[PDB]
Symmetry: C2
Subunit: 296 residues, 2 copies
């Protein structure tokens, strides 16, 4: 069951951009893909938010998925992020299907106006039109969890990346959906939140940290699976400062912190694309202090 295979770490790769002209450096992307899949990560998500999906043209988005399937060459499941207007999401999905992806992850709609009934229809229509394994990234607190309960029966909804950091809500929705729907519950907010989500029912989590230190994410996963609380909290305390730094400025630092940290480690990442520019000298020092703390 694909759902079971998704109950692990979903690594979200960065999309390296050249500082010179902002173009994608595919050689660097290959190095990123290798670092992730060659180090214990069995699920990779091109066109995810950590990939700066929205900074990519549709052609670039399709090519990233295409290149991912090629570079991965069976070493991991490939989940293609898709989004935008219904017809566009379907176009991206079909391109991903032909490219050889294993499933698609439907980003949450970015429209300024959304309602529960409309969000349900949005996801449902794309999943039914594609007739292909799909995951949904659920992150708007203003939209009722009932949407997930109603989508659960869909054959092709194999998982949900729950991204609302409301533990009571998550615990409740996990228990409001029959086991016969086989939904893989994944913490969509990474390592800082994974321990808490895990206790509440999650069996997997996303990670941007795998772009530089996949070993740390794997350690977290194994500790959680082994029910080794002591180890879990140890690795958590070790990782959370990095996640806190990424979360600065209402998450504005989310990808740029990863890229500047990678570059300080001499890994190739390049820069972020506008609407996000480089870190301030202040944050650069904080990144340095973190890597120093990790003895890297």
């Amino acid at each position: 069951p694909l759902a079971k295979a998704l109950e692990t770490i979903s690594g979200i790769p960065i999309t390296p951009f050249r500082k010179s002209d902002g173009s994608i450096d595919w050689h660097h992307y290959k190095e990123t893909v290798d670092r992730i899949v060659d180090n214990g990560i069995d699920v990779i998500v091109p066109c995810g938010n950590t990939s700066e999906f929205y900074a990519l043209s549709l052609e670039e988005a399709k090519e990233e998925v295409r290149r991912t399937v090629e570079y991965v060459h069976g070493r991991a499941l490939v989940v293609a992020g898709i989004g935008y207007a219904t017809s566009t999401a379907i176009e991206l999905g079909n391109a991903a299907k032909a490219a050889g992806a294993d499933a698609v992850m439907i980003h949450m709609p970015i429209h300024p106006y959304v309602t529960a009934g409309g969000v349900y229809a949005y996801f449902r229509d794309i999943i039914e039109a594609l007739d292909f394994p799909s995951l949904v990234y659920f992150k708007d607190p203003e939209i009722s969890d009932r949407v997930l309960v109603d989508l659960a029966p869909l054959q092709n909804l194999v998982g949900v990346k729950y991204a609302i950091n409301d533990l009571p809500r998550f615990a409740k929705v996990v228990r409001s959906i029959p086991e016969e729907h086989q939904i893989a519950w994944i913490c969509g907010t990474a390592e800082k939140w994974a321990p808490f989500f895990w206790h509440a029912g999650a069996k997997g989590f996303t990670s941007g940290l795998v772009n530089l230190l996949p070993q740390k994410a794997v350690e977290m996963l194994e500790a959680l699976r082994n029910n080794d609380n002591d180890a879990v909290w140890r690795i958590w305390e070790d990782i959370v400062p990095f996640e806190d730094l990424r979360g600065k400025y209402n998450q504005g630092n989310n990808v740029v912190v990863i890229k500047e940290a990678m570059e300080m480690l001499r890994q190739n990442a390049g820069v972020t694309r506008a609407p996000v520019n480089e870190l301030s000298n202040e944050d650069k020092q904080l990144v340095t202090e973190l890597l120093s703390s990790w003895k890297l």
Copy 2:
């Protein structure tokens, strides 16, 4: 051009068929006509009221083309554009070729944004297009310094300020020299227009024009004439409608307009997912609102 933008910027809906969600261009033409034939001199296809993000890139381009055709000189056409910088530039160049007068760059929808990056985002698009541009500024987490730094751009002709923070708005208006000539537009419509006007705005956006353009015109004229009693009277009259549209964190923004238009026998069709039809409760609230405006036909 900046001066011409100091007025009402009408944002047309994009009529969608209930049957298959396709765009009904005949209904779109009717909407464009209702807007421009009733005092509105600036129309903004691909605006958020137009459900821009629910349109494919090709549908967005076609809407701009259709607008230029249906308007045929009766008003300035400002094309909404957005997405990745290259994509925004593609949409912008398409609008230019279609005959648009300017473009409105939507606030980027990327989940991760920083002040320096947003500045670069807008700057890169404006410089690449070398065409009159407006920016929709609505994220309170992004410093107004971004606007101060963009102001010098020759092609930045206006800002649709959409952060309902009056002290912030009043200060940024006074932080940019007259030398940069910027049309300051209240991007949050009639409910906020009177307050923004007092603080320095000389224009405002409106979704209300899709059904009752005369009400929007009345507010603009009252504000321009400094007729305070009239401003507040018109304001109190329109607020309930804007509050109903604002329900569910703005989820009701367009659907309320469309169901209200249909009740008034104006062709609007429905909204596209991620927004579906109104609940019975809200349908009743729209009815009671139209009834209070004395717009519903007598029954018996």
